[PDB]
Design an enzyme around this catalytic site. Structure first.
Site, PDB file in Angstrom:
ATOM      1  N   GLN A  24       0.811  -1.359   0.012  1.00 60.53           N
ATOM      2  CA  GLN A  24       0.088  -0.045   0.078  1.00 60.53           C
ATOM      3  C   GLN A  24       0.762   1.313   0.135  1.00 60.53           C
ATOM      4  O   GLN A  24       0.496   2.332  -0.435  1.00 60.53           O
ATOM      5  CB  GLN A  24      -1.033   0.079   1.328  1.00 60.53           C
ATOM      6  CG  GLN A  24      -0.120   0.048   2.385  1.00 60.53           C
ATOM      7  CD  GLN A  24      -1.104   0.252   3.630  1.00 60.53           C
ATOM      8  OE1 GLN A  24      -0.942   1.194   4.329  1.00 60.53           O
ATOM      9  NE2 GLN A  24      -1.801  -0.863   4.028  1.00 60.53           N
ATOM     10  N   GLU A  27       6.685   0.882  -3.290  1.00 59.59           N
ATOM     11  CA  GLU A  27       8.080   0.414  -2.818  1.00 59.59           C
ATOM     12  C   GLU A  27       8.800   0.744  -1.723  1.00 59.59           C
ATOM     13  O   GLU A  27       9.868   1.283  -1.905  1.00 59.59           O
ATOM     14  CB  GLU A  27       9.015   0.250  -4.011  1.00 59.59           C
ATOM     15  CG  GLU A  27       9.421  -1.076  -4.829  1.00 59.59           C
ATOM     16  CD  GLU A  27       8.083  -1.825  -5.043  1.00 59.59           C
ATOM     17  OE1 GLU A  27       7.245  -1.302  -5.731  1.00 59.59           O
ATOM     18  OE2 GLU A  27       8.169  -3.167  -4.891  1.00 59.59           O
ATOM     19  N   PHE A  84      12.675   5.454  10.574  1.00 55.27           N
ATOM     20  CA  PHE A  84      11.531   4.588  10.611  1.00 55.27           C
ATOM     21  C   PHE A  84      10.656   5.157  11.481  1.00 55.27           C
ATOM     22  O   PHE A  84      10.797   5.277  12.609  1.00 55.27           O
ATOM     23  CB  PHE A  84      12.006   3.104  11.004  1.00 55.27           C
ATOM     24  CG  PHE A  84      10.670   2.336  11.253  1.00 55.27           C
ATOM     25  CD1 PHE A  84      10.159   1.615  10.094  1.00 55.27           C
ATOM     26  CD2 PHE A  84      10.543   1.706  12.572  1.00 55.27           C
ATOM     27  CE1 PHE A  84       9.090   0.883  10.164  1.00 55.27           C
ATOM     28  CE2 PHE A  84       9.388   0.700  12.388  1.00 55.27           C
ATOM     29  CZ  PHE A  84       8.701   0.318  11.104  1.00 55.27           C
ATOM     30  N   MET A  85       9.208   5.420  10.979  1.00 56.82           N
ATOM     31  CA  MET A  85       8.231   5.826  11.664  1.00 56.82           C
ATOM     32  C   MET A  85       7.388   4.630  12.158  1.00 56.82           C
ATOM     33  O   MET A  85       6.732   3.933  11.479  1.00 56.82           O
ATOM     34  CB  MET A  85       7.372   6.857  11.007  1.00 56.82           C
ATOM     35  CG  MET A  85       7.988   8.136  10.426  1.00 56.82           C
ATOM     36  SD  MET A  85       8.783   9.082  11.759  1.00 56.82           S
ATOM     37  CE  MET A  85       7.213   9.444  12.702  1.00 56.82           C
ATOM     38  N   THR A  86       7.575   4.434  13.585  1.00 58.67           N
ATOM     39  CA  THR A  86       6.973   3.161  14.063  1.00 58.67           C
ATOM     40  C   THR A  86       5.544   2.619  13.972  1.00 58.67           C
ATOM     41  O   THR A  86       5.251   1.513  13.934  1.00 58.67           O
ATOM     42  CB  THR A  86       7.609   3.160  15.725  1.00 58.67           C
ATOM     43  OG1 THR A  86       8.849   3.354  15.995  1.00 58.67           O
ATOM     44  CG2 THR A  86       6.914   1.951  16.494  1.00 58.67           C
ATOM     45  N   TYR A  87       4.641   3.726  13.736  1.00 62.27           N
ATOM     46  CA  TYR A  87       3.094   3.392  13.958  1.00 62.27           C
ATOM     47  C   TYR A  87       2.615   3.644  12.418  1.00 62.27           C
ATOM     48  O   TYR A  87       1.444   3.043  12.365  1.00 62.27           O
ATOM     49  CB  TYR A  87       2.279   4.127  14.663  1.00 62.27           C
ATOM     50  CG  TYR A  87       2.639   3.604  16.347  1.00 62.27           C
ATOM     51  CD1 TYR A  87       3.490   4.401  16.987  1.00 62.27           C
ATOM     52  CD2 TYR A  87       1.789   3.094  16.685  1.00 62.27           C
ATOM     53  CE1 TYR A  87       3.905   4.146  18.288  1.00 62.27           C
ATOM     54  CE2 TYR A  87       2.357   2.523  18.131  1.00 62.27           C
ATOM     55  CZ  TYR A  87       3.001   3.048  18.677  1.00 62.27           C
ATOM     56  OH  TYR A  87       3.315   2.846  20.229  1.00 62.27           O
ATOM     57  N   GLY A  88       3.373   3.867  11.481  1.00 62.35           N
ATOM     58  CA  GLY A  88       2.964   3.911  10.203  1.00 62.35           C
ATOM     59  C   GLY A  88       2.063   5.055   9.889  1.00 62.35           C
ATOM     60  O   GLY A  88       2.085   6.190  10.329  1.00 62.35           O
ATOM     61  N   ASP A 130       0.313  17.371  -1.471  1.00 62.49           N
ATOM     62  CA  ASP A 130      -0.203  16.265  -1.410  1.00 62.49           C
ATOM     63  C   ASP A 130      -0.437  15.853   0.233  1.00 62.49           C
ATOM     64  O   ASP A 130      -0.473  14.864   0.617  1.00 62.49           O
ATOM     65  CB  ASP A 130       0.395  15.023  -1.873  1.00 62.49           C
ATOM     66  CG  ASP A 130      -0.464  13.851  -2.163  1.00 62.49           C
ATOM     67  OD1 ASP A 130      -1.594  13.938  -2.053  1.00 62.49           O
ATOM     68  OD2 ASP A 130       0.290  12.944  -2.765  1.00 62.49           O
ATOM     69  N   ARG A 134      -3.406   9.865   5.165  1.00 62.34           N
ATOM     70  CA  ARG A 134      -2.596   8.614   4.470  1.00 62.34           C
ATOM     71  C   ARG A 134      -1.010   9.175   4.127  1.00 62.34           C
ATOM     72  O   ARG A 134      -0.227   8.415   4.136  1.00 62.34           O
ATOM     73  CB  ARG A 134      -3.111   8.313   3.144  1.00 62.34           C
ATOM     74  CG  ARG A 134      -3.479   9.434   2.352  1.00 62.34           C
ATOM     75  CD  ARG A 134      -3.610   9.107   0.806  1.00 62.34           C
ATOM     76  NE  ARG A 134      -3.337  10.184  -0.140  1.00 62.34           N
ATOM     77  CZ  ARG A 134      -4.363  11.100  -0.357  1.00 62.34           C
ATOM     78  NH1 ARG A 134      -5.813  10.848  -0.072  1.00 62.34           N
ATOM     79  NH2 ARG A 134      -3.758  11.882  -1.214  1.00 62.34           N
ATOM     80  N   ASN A 135      -0.955  10.377   4.154  1.00 63.07           N
ATOM     81  CA  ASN A 135       0.332  10.815   3.789  1.00 63.07           C
ATOM     82  C   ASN A 135       1.154  11.503   5.016  1.00 63.07           C
ATOM     83  O   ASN A 135       2.132  12.182   4.962  1.00 63.07           O
ATOM     84  CB  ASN A 135       0.374  11.973   2.857  1.00 63.07           C
ATOM     85  CG  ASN A 135      -0.007  11.196   1.307  1.00 63.07           C
ATOM     86  OD1 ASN A 135      -0.046  10.011   1.430  1.00 63.07           O
ATOM     87  ND2 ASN A 135      -0.576  11.855   0.409  1.00 63.07           N
ATOM     88  N   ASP A 148       5.632  12.477   2.167  1.00 60.98           N
ATOM     89  CA  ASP A 148       5.191  12.233   0.790  1.00 60.98           C
ATOM     90  C   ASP A 148       5.496  13.616   0.061  1.00 60.98           C
ATOM     91  O   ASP A 148       4.528  14.169  -0.077  1.00 60.98           O
ATOM     92  CB  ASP A 148       3.695  11.932   0.767  1.00 60.98           C
ATOM     93  CG  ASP A 148       3.564  10.392   0.971  1.00 60.98           C
ATOM     94  OD1 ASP A 148       3.694   9.658   0.081  1.00 60.98           O
ATOM     95  OD2 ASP A 148       3.406  10.016   2.121  1.00 60.98           O
TER      96      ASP A 148
END
Ligand SMILES: Cc1ccc2[nH]ncc2c1/C=C/n1cnc2c(Nc3ccc(P(C)(C)=O)cc3)ncnc21
Length: 281
Positions: A24, A27, A84-88, A130, A134-135, A148
């Site tokens: 989702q 890549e 890395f963002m731990t929770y997405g 954007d 979600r971003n 993003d």
């Protein structure tokens, strides 16, 4: 040394562990910077759009913008490497959260953090293009960062015009952008209004049950999304300011951030006391 580039990392410094999310994110992989045992995120290609996002991320830095750590863009496969963002992503975070944890004050904290980042881009004379839940990405303790930047850019005029064939996520896109491909910091403000509504609804989809084909016509008739149940009057007023039809009528992110900063601070006070009550059980 003559070919030094502060951002260029060696590909072999990174272990690619697995593809994140559910394809989702495209890549984007969780990786490890092996030297440091640091978990990172890595976006890979195998171009111009990729390299443009890489170029932009080198130029912006802020506590609430996802942090570029490096790139591999001397040869394919190209990499962009970030913390890395731990929770997405924020949208799924909101949809799955415990609202006793993610409480009214945390919704204000989220809007404060995003508008902080946009106020920065605003004075840097960047546009993002954007903005959406979600971003945005979430870390520990409801840390939120904007991400993003593939369409982000440093502005040369008051307006940027996207190329003739371009298509946009209609429900986040300001009227002037839908009709004339015109973007500015003010169409970012409009999208931020929609993001606010995603936050207030804990991640509902905008304009529910309204056909994409209908959206501009509704907007032109002055239809705007309703105040979500539980949304403070003042927050909803700010949404409606963000959705003024004429761009110059929308608030700056400087104004937006200051307002949310104030609301956050007031709300924190009651939250901190309510926490301390309840620990004294
Ligand atoms: C590498 C990269 C390069 C350019 C970029 N521009 N914008 C974002 C990025 C990223 C990616 C950033 N990023 C950092 N952490 C991420 C992440 N983290 C994540 C953490 C946990 C989960 P779950 C809840 C399924 O365990 C899913 C994703 N998901 C997507 N992008 C992420």
């Amino acid at each position: 040394s003559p070919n030094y580039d502060k951002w260029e990392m060696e590909r072999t410094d990174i272990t690619m562990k697995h593809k994140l999310g559910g394809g989702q994110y495209g890549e984007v992989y969780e990786g490890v910077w092996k030297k440091y045992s640091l978990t990172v995120a890595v976006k890979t290609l195998k171009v111009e759009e990729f390299l443009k996002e890489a170029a932009v991320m080198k130029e912006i830095k802020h506590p609430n913008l996802v942090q570029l750590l490096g790139v591999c863009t001397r040869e394919p496969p190209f990499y962009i490497i970030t913390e890395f963002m731990t929770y997405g992503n924020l949208l799924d975070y909101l949809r799955e959260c415990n609202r006793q944890e993610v409480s009214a004050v945390v919704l204000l904290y989220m809007a404060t953090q995003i508008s902080s980042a946009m106020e920065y881009l605003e004075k840097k004379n960047f546009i993002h293009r954007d903005l959406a839940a979600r971003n945005c990405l979430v870390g520990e303790n409801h840390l939120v960062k904007v991400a993003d930047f593939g369409l982000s850019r440093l502005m040369t005029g008051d307006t940027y015009t996207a190329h003739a064939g371009a298509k946009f996520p209609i429900k986040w896109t300001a009227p002037e952008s839908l009709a004339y491909n015109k973007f500015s910091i003010k169409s970012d403000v409009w999208a931020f209004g929609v993001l606010l509504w995603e936050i207030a609804t804990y991640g509902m989809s905008p304009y529910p049950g309204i056909d994409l084909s209908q959206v501009y016509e509704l907007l032109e008739k002055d239809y705007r999304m309703e105040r979500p149940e539980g949304c403070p009057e003042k927050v909803y007023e700010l949404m409606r300011a963000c959705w003024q039809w004429n761009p110059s009528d929308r608030p700056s992110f400087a104004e937006i951030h200051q307002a949310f900063e104030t609301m956050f601070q007031e709300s924190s006070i009651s939250d901190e006391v309510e926490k301390e009550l309840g620990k004294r059980g």
